[PDB]
């Protein structure tokens, strides 16, 4: 409405803490990474296994 | 055409026509039947032109001919007066007969308790056989029909002027049709008229 009183702030962040996995490997740079996506998806393992499936899907 | 003198009519027909009360028509003005009319009787009623009735009947008959199986022309009447009429036609010519109720869907309906395969429909009044007339134009079938001056002309290809309601009018036209198709292709042959009388057709006529 209009009100005036702040109450609670950063409540969720006050009990969630971050952590890190570091690296086995670097996250790839430019041209090499762009090429890598096309090879990893298609020329491998030429696709014949599975269907209707995402790159991060649990379906 | 055919052998040719009796296909320009003859007195025998003109007597049968007058007797059966073909000649009288409706009192509704026309725009599609108008050409056919000979002259108008005083204070309404149209006198159909027997010359026109002939030519159309022959063109109709000819279309049934050039089919080597006469079964795939469905003769249709739902009128009482023409139930006996079509039954005799089917015996004679070899038509597949539909007397009494049509029962909707026999040229339509994949799942049905009856199906008929025609190629040409002959109708006795398309305002009583309206169900076949509508059904036929959903499945690409030509329809000849016996039409007066107040019958629908939509989805009718070839009309035959005639009263074609009640009495001996419906009977006689079935008799003359059967006679005509048998001339070209039958066993009357040589374009000369039938030895069967029109009285075998007509209505039942209440039996004493």
């Amino acid at each position: 409405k209009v009100h005036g009183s702040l109450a609670r702030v950063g409540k969720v962040r006050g009990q969630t803490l971050k952590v890190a996995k570091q690296e086995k490997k670097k996250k790839r740079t430019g041209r090499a990474k762009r090429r890598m996506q096309y090879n990893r998806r298609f020329v491998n393992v030429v696709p014949t296994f599975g269907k209707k499936k995402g790159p991060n899907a649990n379906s | 055409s055919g052998a040719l003198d009796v296909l320009q009519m003859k007195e025998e027909d003109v007597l049968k026509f007058l007797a059966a009360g073909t000649h009288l028509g409706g009192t509704n003005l026309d725009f599609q039947m108008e050409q056919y009319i000979y002259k108008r009787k005083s204070d309404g009623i149209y006198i159909i032109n027997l010359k026109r009735t002939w030519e159309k009947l022959l063109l109709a008959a000819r279309a049934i001919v050039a089919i080597e199986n006469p079964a795939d022309v469905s003769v249709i009447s739902s009128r009482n007066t023409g139930q006996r009429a079509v039954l005799k036609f089917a015996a004679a010519t070899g038509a597949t007969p539909i007397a009494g109720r049509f029962t909707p869907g026999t040229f339509t309906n994949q799942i049905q308790a009856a199906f008929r395969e025609p190629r040409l429909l002959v109708v006795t009044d398309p305002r009583a056989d309206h169900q076949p007339l509508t059904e036929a134009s959903y499945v690409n079938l030509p329809t000849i029909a016996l039409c007066n001056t107040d019958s629908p002309l939509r989805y009718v290809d070839i009309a035959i002027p005639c009263n074609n309601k009640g009495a001996h009018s419906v009977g006689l036209m079935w008799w003359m049709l059967a006679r005509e198709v048998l001339r070209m292709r039958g066993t009357i042959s040589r374009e000369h008229p039938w030895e069967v009388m029109p009285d075998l057709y007509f209505y039942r006529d209440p039996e004493e």
Binding site: - | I67, E68, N69, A71, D72, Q110, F115, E117, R119, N140
Partner: protein, 226 residues
């Protein structure tokens, strides 16, 4: 595992002629302008290179006497990439059933779409010969031919239909309601079919008409009935 099957049941002259191979293509049937009431005819002449795209799976409903009721309405489009396409709508109790029926309906309705050129005349048709418009519910889609290498410039739903149609190059403008998708596909379907309905001066030259396959094959098609 699972495997399909096929069976032929004729109730009409046309089914018998197709299986006997006195008709070798749908084009003959289309020319004579006779209905197709058997899916098997389309399957027999083609049955390969037929892609079925479900355009939407959207549910609708009506209120029953006690609480709600709901059902699935499916739109399926079918077509080869050689100038033949169909559209079929079916509504059934479940999603799967609605699509299954829709496919059968889509096949049955298959219609030729004429393919022409922008201005060219050599190297085989890439578009349409005439601009064709179709309306559905106040949506109007206008297809305009486009030259080679332009590609299909259309919204996703009409573009898919055009692709199957064999129109690889097209300009479109659609006006009206854009929220409605069943209408949009239907209007494009009206437009593509209209190409045959246009009379071009290249199509003026006249013909002596069919004597009907029913009449000519009459004797052949006595099997137990004509």
């Amino acid at each position: 595992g699972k495997a399909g099957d096929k069976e032929w049941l004729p109730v009409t002259k046309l089914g018998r002629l197709v299986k006997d191979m006195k008709i070798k293509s749908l084009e003959e049937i289309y020319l004579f302008s006779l209905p197709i009431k058997e899916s098997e005819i389309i399957d027999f002449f083609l049955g390969a290179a037929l892609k079925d795209k479900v355009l939407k799976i959207m549910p609708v409903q009506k209120q029953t006497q006690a609480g709600q009721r709901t059902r699935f309405k499916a739109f399926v489009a079918i077509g080869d990439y050689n100038g033949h396409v169909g559209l079929g709508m079916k509504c059934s109790k479940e999603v799967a059933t609605a699509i299954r029926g829709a496919i059968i309906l889509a096949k049955l309705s298959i219609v030729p779409v004429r393919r022409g050129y922008w201005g060219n005349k050599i190297g085989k048709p890439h578009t349409v010969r005439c601009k064709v418009t179709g309306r559905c519910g106040s949506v109007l889609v206008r297809l305009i031919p486009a030259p080679r290498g332009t590609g299909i410039i259309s919204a996703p739903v009409p573009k898919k239909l055009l692709l199957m149609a064999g129109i690889d190059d097209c300009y479109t403008s659609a006006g009206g309601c854009t929220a409605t998708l069943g209408n949009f596909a239907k209007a494009t379907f009206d437009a593509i079919s209209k190409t045959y309905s246009y009379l071009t001066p290249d199509l003026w030259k006249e013909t002596v008409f069919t004597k009907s396959p029913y009449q000519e094959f009459t004797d052949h098609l006595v099997k137990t009935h004509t």
